[PDB]
């Protein structure tokens with residue numbers, strides 16, 4: 001199964017920058033969402049969940065097909081709450097109907113990371129919407145009530161190594177858990193992209209508590225929380241070394257997250273030899289907008 005990137009007809013960098021900008025301006029405008037966290041975190045999570053269905057073994061799933069628009073995936077219990085991201089992106093899609101769904105969902109996550117003062121994430125266009133029958137089944141996204149070995153094995157399906165897994169997980173500096181979505185509650189509710197996931201893991205006094213869904217989570221008095229799979233990153237000594245690296249080197253973390261996140265968003269896609277180079281979008285701030 002090959003999915004070959006096909007550039008939206010006639011489109012170039014400037015077209016996608018306009019899309020980025022529309023996203024970015026709406027992120028700034030619609031600031032009230034989720035008790036003033038804004039939409040950045042849920043957009044990042046959307047881009048991850050639309051990509052995280054991928055299976056390297058048969059090239060099923062992944063961002064290419066834009067299959068989150070179909071009910072089976074839209075309704076995946078693992079995707080609870082992402083509807084808010086989809087709804088945010090809806091008016092963007094209506095303005096730019098020529099952009100593919102996979103391109104839009106992935107670009108939403110890139111835009112969100114950048115506008116939240118994260119690293120630049122190079123991004124490539126050319127995902128093509130595929131039919132409803134190409135929608136992967138539910139169950140390919142990860143459970144949170146697991147340990148490091150589960151994390152490691154799970155991410156092998158996405159062709160991600162220890163460093164890539166630890167780097168990607170630093171997105172958990174963003175947003176929060178919502179009991180009604182996932183059976184977990186709380187978190188810093190942060191909307192600025194930093195290496196604070198790793199700092200929090202190492203520096204907080206974590207207590208293993210049971211939440212109101214009767215699930216275990218790690219909580220601190222500062223109001224931070226870690227899922228069991230997050231905390232596993234300091235229980236496994238191979239992950240712990242990388243945690244410490246990223247806690248002590250913001251730039252390194254940025255650079256590694258950018259590479260891993262682009263890879264995540266591109267898994268499954270074959271880019272022709274004369275496809276455009278990846279785009280690096282200017283932030284609103286960089287544009288004076």
Ligand code: HEM
Pocket residue numbers: 041042044045048080081142143144145151168169171172174175176177178179181182183184227229261
């Ligand atoms: C073992 C891997 C992972 C598991 C088990 C996991 C699980 C979770 C859970 C349970 C939530 C709470 C959702 C809610 O209650 O609304 C969450 C939130 C989030 N996740 Fe992950 N996640 C994982 C990996 C990742 C990765 C790789 C990324 C991105 C690179 C990511 C980005 C996010 C973001 C941004 C949120 C916050 C959403 C919000 O504030 O609405 N996650 N994830």
